């Protein structure tokens, strides 16, 4: 929540 | 009659020199008299002075034809060379009639082939510029001689390649490639372009002239020497042709060429395809549509230890598995084409660092597909990626091996482990290898990219309370709270993520 959906958005940026 | 015949050419009035020219020409077609023409320097000189000064086209054709017949023997060859001949026939490469043009280029060709010091002489006279300007002619035999002349001079001479480039060399040589079918002319032209392709200044000029597509037309020719010279030239230019359009036919042939029995053909094909798929989304699709994933996997299975083949093929697989539409399907296709076991195996020796670095990046992109998590695990990818990570990190602590950046392995290994940690089973293996101390020590790295993959794999591991406590036990809270205010947003997001999952 809030901080976690931040992480998944930056994860797609790093590789996908 | 040789002693008297020099005066009739060193004299005014057309017919006197014309007749003499149309009289020394005949004394050249006969061996007994011709042996006496080369024997006399006053003769040889006089024909050179007449040829480059004449106004009548029959004198020009008869003189240039006389020296051409002289150029069939050693003593006549150096007679041309000694009597200042080369500057004259270089001048005659600008004649408007084709007879003297033919005679001059064949005489210069014989001199370039059999006369010592003629390559330096032709170069100085401005021959290279004249030869390039003649490349717009239409006689393929004339073009074959002219391009072989250029190859004789450009081979191993940097100054020569530059002059050819300044004269519009590449475009004229590319035009020949995409117009004619005479094998000898195509093979000779390809030799010139191969020599020019090793020069960084000729590389974009050949590419901008459409030389990549032009060489692709002859990849299926029955001449083995022509296809391999075409392939070698394409390999050289490949890194400077990542923007060209109209690559559909070339890419299609290269994919088919990967199944070749010839070792050099396969190596060149993988090498060109690797460079051509680097940061070109359009090329990545086309290769996938023609079943390139299958072809490159089979190519890797066939190479085994041949790293000159596996390194470019795995590079191309790395390109085709990320940052384009069909990348998801290309990630599955590597598994569906039985490629996963070979990819992991290539992480282990006797693979060297170039191959390893390319394989890690592929595994990184392969791990994006959750259907690849288990089959990568059962191949032993996790303990090997950690083994490489530990060794690479141990080397950066000494306060560039085999050409690879040693911290690029730290970023690549940790990044691949970050992706694999998305799966819970993979997390068990990562955690069971004692890697949390290493992942916390990487937070203190100054390279922002290493800090990002380290906090990333720490974030996935922290889904489990037991792992989050161990991470906290290694004093990760302090560097993570500092990384909260990192200039890199991806690290701040990751650092905030690991601290959040430390809720207990
Ligand atoms: C908090 C948050 O939303 N962070 C965030 C969102 C998106 C990205 N995207 C990229 O980096 C492309 C990063 C961080």
Numbering used by the authors:
A (entry chain B): 2 to 17
B (entry chain A): 152 to 550, 560 to 664
From the paper:
To target disease-causing proteins that are inaccessible to small-molecule or antibody therapies, we are exploring the use of a nature-inspired drug modality that exploits the intrinsically favorable properties of synthetically constrained α-helical polypeptides (Helicons). Here, we report a rapid, high-throughput screening platform utilizing phage display that enables an unbiased mapping of the α-helical interactome of a given protein without any prior knowledge of its structure or known binding partners. Analysis of 14 high-resolution crystal structures of Helicon–protein complexes across six different protein domains reveals a range of binding modes, all of which are “side-on”, i.e., mediated exclusively by Helicon side-chains rather than involving main chain amide interactions. Biochemical and structural experiments demonstrate diverse functional impacts by the Helicons which bind these sites, including inhibition of protein–protein interactions, inhibition of enzymatic activity, induced conformational rearrangement, and induced dimerization.
